[PDB]
Design an enzyme around this catalytic site. Structure first.
Site, short mmCIF file in Angstrom:
data_model
loop_
_atom_site.label_atom_id
_atom_site.label_comp_id
_atom_site.label_asym_id
_atom_site.label_seq_id
_atom_site.Cartn_x
_atom_site.Cartn_y
_atom_site.Cartn_z
N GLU A 166 -48.95 -19.81 17.63
CA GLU A 166 -49.85 -18.65 17.55
C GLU A 166 -51.21 -18.90 18.19
OE1 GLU A 166 -48.94 -15.57 16.82
OE2 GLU A 166 -46.94 -16.21 16.21
N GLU A 185 -57.69 -13.71 18.77
CA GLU A 185 -56.95 -13.08 19.87
C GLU A 185 -57.80 -12.95 21.14
OE1 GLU A 185 -54.94 -9.60 18.48
OE2 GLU A 185 -54.28 -8.96 20.45
#
Length: 242
Positions: free
Chosen positions: A68, A90
């Protein structure tokens, strides 16, 4: 008894060797102390089953979260599987990921944060509620308080959702697939944990680079722990849930 018996500070730094590289985002954020402090809030994590199941759970958790947050590529120093935990947020911050129906605090965004890249107002809502912190009004806590950050990832790992078993129940062998699961090749192993986390994008259509990266992390970490990988590592031929 505690997760630290499975993974000490030295071993944590060996696996997550490059997380505090200048190219990475944490600049110390993902500390061993934050990890073990957060883990205390989820007592069963890394303390369930025999000694190799415990090692296997820590390896599976760290492998998924490593993907991730990976800063790794084929040509990275020490290989792609030494660059877990490079990112905290992100890369694209243009999407607020508010579902328009649950709470969505003015000027806040619910893009990916922390080891599991927690996303969506509904997930910040559920995670905050479980953890006793207001992540709807301050989602940035997931990028700023390292204990909270690891807690969100552990929350995700330990909590079932709908027809989905928790990742914990899978890696500890406490999940019995349904008949529909079995027909979908959703059988216990690391593959179905990938399916839980991102099966819509990553499973059921053959090999993907992303699921391959998750597996590469996992095999590296298992090898360091000296534990076998278990069965059913891939989700190439698993129908996504639903």
């Amino acid at each position: 008894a505690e997760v630290g018996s499975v993974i000490g500070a030295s071993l944590f730094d060996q696996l997550l060797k490059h997380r505090n590289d200048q190219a990475c985002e944490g600049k110390g954020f993902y500390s061993y102390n934050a990890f073990i402090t957060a883990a205390r809030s989820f007592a069963a994590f890394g303390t369930t089953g025999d000694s190799n199941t415990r090692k296997r759970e820590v390896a599976a958790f760290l492998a998924q979260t490593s993907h991730e947050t990976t800063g790794g590529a084929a040509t990275s120093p020490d290989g792609p599987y030494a660059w877990g935990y490079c990112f905290v947020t992100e890369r694209d911050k243009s999407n607020r990921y508010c579902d328009g129906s649950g709470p969505c605090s003015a000027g806040k965004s619910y893009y990916g944060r922390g080891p599991i890249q927690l996303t969506h107002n509904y997930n910040y809502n559920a995670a905050g509620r479980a953890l006793g912190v207001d992540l709807i009004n301050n989602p940035d806590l997931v990028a700023r308080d390292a204990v909270v950050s690891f807690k969100t990832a552990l929350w995700f790992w330990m909590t079932p959702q709908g027809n989905k078993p928790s990742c914990h129940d899978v890696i500890t062998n406490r999940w019995t697939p349904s008949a529909a699961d079995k027909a979908a090749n959703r059988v216990p192993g690391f593959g179905v944990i990938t399916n839980i986390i991102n099966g819509g994008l990553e499973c059921g259509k053959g090999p993907t680079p992303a699921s391959g990266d998750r597996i590469g992390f996992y095999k590296r970490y298992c090898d360091v722990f000296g534990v076998s990988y278990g069965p059913n590592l891939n989700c190439r031929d698993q129908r996504p849930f639903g």
